[PDB]
Symmetry: C2
Subunit: 204 residues, 2 copies
Amino acid sequence: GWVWNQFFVIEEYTGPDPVLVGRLHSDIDSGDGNIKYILSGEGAGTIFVIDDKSGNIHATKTLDREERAQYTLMAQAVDRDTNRPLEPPSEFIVKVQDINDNEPIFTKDVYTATVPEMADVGTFVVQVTATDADDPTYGNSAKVVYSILQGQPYFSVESETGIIKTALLNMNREQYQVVIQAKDMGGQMGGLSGTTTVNITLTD
Amino acid sequence: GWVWNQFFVIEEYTGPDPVLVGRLHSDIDSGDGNIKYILSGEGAGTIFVIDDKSGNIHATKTLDREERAQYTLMAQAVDRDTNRPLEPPSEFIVKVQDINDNEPIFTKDVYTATVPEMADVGTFVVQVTATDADDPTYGNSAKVVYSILQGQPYFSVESETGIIKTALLNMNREQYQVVIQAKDMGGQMGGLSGTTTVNITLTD
Ligand SMILES: [Ca+2]
Ligand SMILES: [Ca+2]
Ligand SMILES: [Ca+2]
Ligand SMILES: [Ca+2]
Ligand SMILES: [Ca+2]
Ligand SMILES: [Ca+2]
């Protein structure tokens, strides 16, 4: 049930010379260059190039996991001269590994909501949503949390759902402007962040 | 006959933060962290460390292919809680990939040989040997070639065997000092190089 037929590459290779992805290899390759490795499939001969005596596969361009996350390719091993079937062809996959190179992005840049005056504490106002394109296989690198910049103590926001509620009894002033931040990494150090504005209007 | 159960690491990681070697993974890992990956064997828990929820394996120190070229490890997948056998344990290997970080090195720093005067052209004199620790799996990165710095036209050297021969008929002067260079990369651009001296003495 193990899985070994895959290699990994980092999103955003901002480096000088092309990078190695992995190496194909048949146990019959005795090191005398009489065996010819061949790529084929998604990206073969373009994004992914192979040296057919060694088996090394290289990434020719810089890849974005948001554009494509996974390339499925084929691996053959033929006889240098006759090009006969030496090893049956087998599939393998290269995974553009994620980096948290995208901030949370509020669907809207401005929300408009209404809530009644003199409402009890915890009255629902509106729910904001910051989407995050980072889709790591696992990890909290894309875990969005909502916090209230401007609006306290009048309003509280729910860290996980972006639901805004009233937080002061018996509310003088008619319109409040709230600012909510969506920070990834679970809000931890170095997390990226986007913001939005919520223009609430009390009602009678 | 294909071989996928191996990862690669570059010799001489002179980089700031530790590097990723590869990732273990069972097809039953449904992404809910209920599966626990385990390392064991050569270097496990020391040189090579694993995060048991992800499966990522990291190189903690910088490795030298001249010291060790190959580490054989084990891979297990158990149930987070019961630690039952979930996937049978399977071997895999990490290969410290070569860089040409070693020059040719003449066994000796000075050779002493004798050859008769008036000898015919091509008379054997001595054979020098420059060893090269770089042992790439394949490639000419460690291909040593011998060239004659000082000694022409009196002597010629064989590019591949480091055999020195007489190259001038009817040889006035009694002792000649020859200098031979051993350059790797097949002598190509950027190849490293070591040298030696050969003090020859003509005879009657
Ligand atoms: Ca990107
Ligand atoms: Ca990304
Ligand atoms: Ca993110
Ligand atoms: Ca070294
Ligand atoms: Ca080396
Ligand atoms: Ca060398």
